[PDB]
Amino acid sequence: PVIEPLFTKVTEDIPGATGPVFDKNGDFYIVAPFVEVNGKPAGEILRIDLKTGKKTVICKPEVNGYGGIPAGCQCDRDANQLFVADMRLGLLVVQTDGTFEEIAKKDSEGRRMQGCAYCAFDYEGNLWITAPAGEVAPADFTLSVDEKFGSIYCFTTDGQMIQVDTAFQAPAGIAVRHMNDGRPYQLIVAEQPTKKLWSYDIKGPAKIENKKVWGHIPGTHVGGAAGMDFDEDNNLLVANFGSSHIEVFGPDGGQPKMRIRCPFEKPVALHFKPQTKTIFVTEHENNAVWKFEWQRNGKKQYCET
């Protein structure tokens, strides 16, 4: 089955718009990773007024003269602060006043961080992170689009930054499937160009096993799975960049059980508005943000627990 809901524009003129997130007060944010100054990265985290779509710069992260490429966001639970995956700087924690901190320059083995693109909290508070880029600044920016050097990290509640896997070709969206009792059960990771969704079984903080292909992304277009989010029934909605569709997987994966046709070819990121059926989706055909109504509420995010 294929559904065609009405998409309503939220805001426009945001190059590479991604990282949609709601904070603990219901303020909406997205990131503009392609902002430059003199050919060098100067990406921005924006706050969006939901009534007018007007954009307000919250944070323009730069460290020692190297500008960031903010790319994916999650809201914290114990504090109204945003965990931001940055393709040049690693993991940031951003405050609403625009100040920010770099969380880990090196991983638990002492090795320089790779640039990060998506992240997802489990309900225990560990942050699972995809890192499709090469070494963080001051190294030259590189991207694992053709070669298998993308990595997967877990930033645990004890404050450890643990590389839990590597050798992905452009890992993208990440999400955590929880049991009904709240325990983390599977980690889902998009590997975009291979048209695969991978899963592992979560055994504990930064402990994953049983790596397997969890789902297959339709199509042969350039692109594949980008962002993803679970609904309250643990159906996984996955933006299939390049396909004009968002794929809907059942909780056990496999093939899509349904698809959502989009009025654009390039959906990227998606995020539920808490306590509603409204999905916000970003897309790079119009460099815009849209919303549409899903069949049921989103899965509760860590920040709402």
Author numbering: 4 to 308
The authors write:
More recently, a combination of GCE and laboratory evolution has given rise to enantioselective and oxygen‐tolerant photoenzymes for thermally forbidden [2 + 2]‐cycloadditions. These enzymes make use of 4‐benzoylphenylalanine (BpA) as a genetically encoded triplet photosensitizer. Our own lab used this approach to develop photoenzymes (EnT1.3) for enantioselective [2 + 2]‐cycloadditions of quinolone derivatives by positioning BpA into the hydrophobic pocket of the computationally designed Diels‐Alderase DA_20_00.
Following evaluation of ∼5700 clones, the variant CEnT1.4 emerged, containing seven mutations (CEnT1.0 A21T Y37F I146L L148V Q149D K225V S271V). CEnT1.4 achieves a 4.6‐fold higher conversion of 1 to 1a compared with CEnT1.0 following 60 min of irradiation and shows excellent regio‐ and stereocontrol (62:1 1a:1b, 99% e.e.). The BpA244 photosensitizer sits with the carbonyl group directed away from the bulk solvent, as in structures of EnT1.3. Molecular docking of the product (+)‐1a and the substrate 1 into the crystal structure of CEnT1.4 reveals binding geometries similar to those observed with (‐)‐1a‐bound EnT1.3, with 1 and (+)‐1a in close proximity to the BpA photosensitizer and forming hydrogen bonding interactions with Q195 and Y121. The CEnT1.4–1 simulations show a major population (∼90%) of the substrate pre‐organized for selective catalysis in a well‐sculpted active site pocket formed by hydrophobic residue F37, L146, V148, V225, V271 and BpA244. The substrate also forms a hydrogen bond with Q195, has a C H – π interaction (edge‐to‐face π stacking) with BpA244 but does not form hydrogen bonding contacts with Y121. In agreement with the simulations, a Q195A mutation leads to a substantial reduction in activity and reaction selectivity, consistent with hydrogen bonding between this residue and the substrate being important for selective photocatalysis.
